[PDB]
Design a protein around this ligand. Structure first.
Ligand SMILES: N[C@@H](CCC(=O)O)C(=O)O
Ligand SMILES: N[C@@H](CCC(=O)O)C(=O)O
Ligand SMILES: N[C@@H](CCC(=O)O)C(=O)O
Ligand SMILES: [Hg+2]
Ligand SMILES: [Hg+2]
Ligand SMILES: [Hg+2]
Ligand code: NA
Ligand code: NA
Ligand code: NA
Ligand code: NA
Ligand code: NA
Ligand code: NA
Ligand code: NA
Ligand code: NA
Ligand code: NA
Lengths: 406, 406, 406
């Protein structure tokens, strides 16, 4: 029948039950807790393995698919929508976190421009650049971690160039089309192992909770993120959809119910891409030419909930450490969180590796992620839902704004 | 005429003569000894350069060549034979080494599963993952050394996916076919320099022998390995060949005499692949469709003598250090040695870099390889012979077991 | 109209004016000086990003374009001319620097052979090998920095192999042709940002001059380099051109005036390749089949002024530190400087990273590059001009020596 989401629902309920029963009926040491969540670790190792070919091939094929005369218009209509919706999300998150109050920046601002143009393509696949001043002179070095931001820019430029070359460069277009669909097939292969991995990934996640006092203390912060996500998903996005196209926005969401449920269960926007494609094309009746570009490109660039969570978490951690923020310190968080959303891949544990940059932007230690790591999975489950909903709503907007070219 | 093996025989006899005459008539320092064996070092740098494209392209083309309906059957018939023959070799080696007696394991057991699914494809080409516990919590880091095990798994999955896609993904099949045959051409180019490199590689190998007391002390251990190789090559493999196909097993070996001699002289199963192909196809009259898959895939996965040597050497080093082994400690050696055979490339100095993992599995320092490094080349010369003989015997077995599909 | 060089001339004059006016009218700290030259840093990050695909694809396509029967002859006629002209340049530089007098080698000599055959293709793209002796035994390790020398050799061998395979390996030829022209398109895209980057790259270069006493002290050394470049560009190259082909050498230079001006303004031989192509083909009326091979291959291998500058700077730094040089110490500089010219890419700051090897060849600290870093841009501007002039003159020589095969 349809085991794609039934198996995942069974896995998540079994994971919750197993974690609760084990944590209570037993007292395991930290080493045994680490050994317990090994299958989830293997699932995460596979998901992180698949991202690089996925991102590179998806960007290249999405940009090169557009004809030379329409690449500018459709690309602009997509990028403007992405930037506007993410800025709205960041502003809403900052405003809400400031109102509720749950609790060397230039170097980090220039490091973002330095990482858009890496010095080496091979090294950018597994290493990232960072500079720190010392005596005052600037010293730069390469740390570990894939440089998604530079690879995305290079892939966009390469796709545009190959699309402009035409029949002479058609061989590269064919090569990257085949590579992208091979990567999609490999992701479909991983979806078989996904449920058993998710079971342990959540069971061992609800086991490390030492006393629930962490859950009580992280209260109010969790409400701020959930309220921001609800406002951005139920109010702002349907409103901007209705403004562009005069259609009932909620019928679109109801048609994208399967994709939303899959995203909320697996917490990965890149692995739910086929379901989103099917729901958008077969049900909502969206043109293929534009969705084939909006979906794969926006599955890792357009992440509104991720940006909102980055801004809210950064300001909350700052408030936990005092360090009253000025107006200028608000802005550097807003811009960095926008880059952090673009710099994170469609995998669960993403959004924590990219939060180090936004934390160091305002001069904070990298170890403060542990202040909120405890309950991050529950918020990730809801971040992914709005990350894919934004992509779906962008699809209808671009389609309505591209009627004259179809 | 036929200079492929005549030149190699001349090179090996000249190397033995040169090493003996130099070591005796002269007293060189360690720096001069290092400078003496420079051409062998260059040959090894070239052979290690060629392995990565060779392995990747060979696995991809071998798996994608099979049709979608026959890929499962032939692949299963090959992998079952590989696993069974290697397990037999490991068991025989362990039994012999235990009888003759010449003299934190869970982390190393899970590192093997962690290395089958690397977190990065580019980083897996030159780096490997390892975890060590410290206070107890697990800390992981990436050391140097190509991750052959993860690349093999990814290449197998990619080849299966591309074979299933068909005419749409035929461009990748063509690309990797061309890449594989280009790599074979480059290996044929290196075969010109091979003889002069081998001359110094053995001359400087028989020079570092300080007093022959090392040869006397390593006695009994060398007998255990040679007896195990002889038993596995003369008895077990012909018997399992005769059981499957009712033909004289020794006629097959006699037809593969040129390949066996080349493997025994150059000590590299990947560089003797064309000779093995020629001997199996032109003389033994083996079908091309199945040999084109069994030979290149099995030239680095199917290594029986390597696994036997790993097990015997690990147990011998353990006995030199006391540390009486339990039944459980025998098993972790057996499984790790099976992975070590798969994880080693078809190059001479391989089998020593992969022995560090099997030594650390039972909690031993990485510097104990020096206890047997002195006479390792002589045992490598015989390991390669049985490594290629196992591949040849597997070819006839799979062919006889694949008559109905040809 | 023609904004390619008018904009660059405006940028260079504005950069000189801005640097002079700022350095005098203001007293900035070192951190502010570093922040001032940020756009030049971004331009350099982009230029260093583009070199690896450019080099690999250019070598592969240039070698594979030649037919199997003519690849040996044309390749030999090009490589002999390259080696002879570079040796002449090195000898002239050494002679001039010795006459004017402005002021563990075996390990560094064998490291060059070790770097021609790297142990890993992926690691060679961003790392380089070096050995140092310690107690005496040799210990080797990998430092950072792209290994251009090994990649060039592998690309040459791969191109020859693919050209010999023919229609069977034509898919790789097509792939690399498309990749090379895509890289050229990306370089043309970077040429838009080039002028604004050059403005700051020179403005902040003439700002770090502390007191002009450095300019006075570096006098005589600058004259030695300029005189060597003038002699090699005005006398030796036209003479060797006239000897081969009985045509007026200076008419060729006058036709290559646009390319020479572009090279002198942007100080990058790889980014001025399209202009050199246009000037050589449309004006000088050179056959396309031979220029398509001589230009892209020689744009990074044939660098005469770079080698002359390396030799002169190394001997000048040695004379600043006393350390009287023997005849043997002259030779190791000459051979290393020849490799340093081949090992440097067509980017401005190149020639300083490759000078560390030639400085360590004679046993000198790597920090002595700061003795001449102050005025290096002015000498680079003239190095690039002769680097492209040598390529142009080689084109006519090979064409005249290849009449019978066209
Ligand atoms: N879960 C996100 C990745 C980024 C994040 O978790 O913050 C997604 O797949 O859309
Ligand atoms: N000599 C082996 C490689 C592995 C080893 O030496 O143990 C072969 O080429 O088959
Ligand atoms: N500027 C040189 C690069 C090498 C050097 O600067 O020494 C060129 O592009 O030709
Ligand atoms: Hg969780
Ligand atoms: Hg040996
Ligand atoms: Hg300058
Ligand atoms: Na967005
Ligand atoms: Na998304
Ligand atoms: Na992202
Ligand atoms: Na085996
Ligand atoms: Na083998
Ligand atoms: Na192996
Ligand atoms: Na030259
Ligand atoms: Na040049
Ligand atoms: Na060069």
């Amino acid at each position: 029948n349809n085991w794609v989401l039934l198996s995942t629902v069974a896995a998540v309920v079994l994971g919750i039950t197993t974690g609760v029963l084990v944590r209570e009926h037993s007292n395991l040491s930290t080493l045994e807790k680490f050994y317990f969540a090994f299958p989830g670790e293997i699932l995460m190792r596979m998901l992180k393995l698949i991202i690089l070919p996925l991102i590179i091939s998806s960007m290249i094929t999405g940009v090169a698919a557009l004809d030379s005369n329409v690449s500018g218009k459709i690309g602009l209509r997509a990028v403007v929508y992405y930037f506007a919706t993410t800025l709205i999300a960041v502003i809403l998150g900052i405003v809400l976190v400031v109102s509720i109050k749950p609790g060397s920046t230039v170097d980090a601002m220039l490091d973002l421009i330095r990482n858009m143009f890496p010095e080496n393509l091979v090294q950018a696949a597994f290493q990232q650049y960072k500079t720190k001043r010392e005596e005052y002179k600037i010293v730069g070095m390469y740390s570990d971690g894939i440089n998604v931001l530079g690879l995305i820019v290079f892939a966009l430029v390469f796709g545009l160039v190959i699309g402009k070359m035409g029949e002479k460069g058609q061989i590269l277009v064919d090569f990257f089309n085949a590579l992208s669909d091979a990567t999609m097939k490999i992701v479909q292969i991983i979806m078989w192992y996904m449920p058993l991995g998710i079971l342990f990934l959540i069971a061992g996640c609800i086991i490390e909770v030492e006393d629930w006092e962490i859950f009580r203390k992280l209260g109010l912060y969790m409400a701020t993120v959930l309220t921001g996500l609800a406002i951005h998903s139920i109010v702002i996005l349907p409103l901007i959809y209705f403004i562009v196209v005069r259609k009932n926005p909620f019928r679109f969401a109801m048609g994208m119910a399967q994709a939303l449920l899959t995203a909320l269960m697996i917490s990965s926007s890149s692995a739910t891409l086929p379901v989103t494609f099917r729901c958008a094309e077969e049900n909502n009746q969206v043109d293929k030419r534009i969705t084939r570009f909006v979906l794969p490109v926006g599955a890792t660039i357009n992440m509104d909930g991720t940006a909102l969570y980055e801004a809210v978490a950064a300001v909350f951690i700052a408030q936990l450490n005092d360090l009253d923020l000025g107006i200028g310190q608000i802005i550097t968080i807003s811009i960095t969180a926008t880059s952090a959303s673009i710099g994170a891949a469609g995998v669960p544990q993403a959004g924590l590796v990219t939060m180090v940059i936004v934390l160091s932007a305002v001069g904070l230690p990298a170890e403060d992620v542990t202040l909120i790591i405890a309950v991050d999975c529950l918020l990730d489950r809801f971040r992914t839902m709005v990350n894919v909903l934004g992509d779906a709503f962008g699809t209808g907007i671009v389609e309505k704004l591209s009627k004259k070219e179809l």
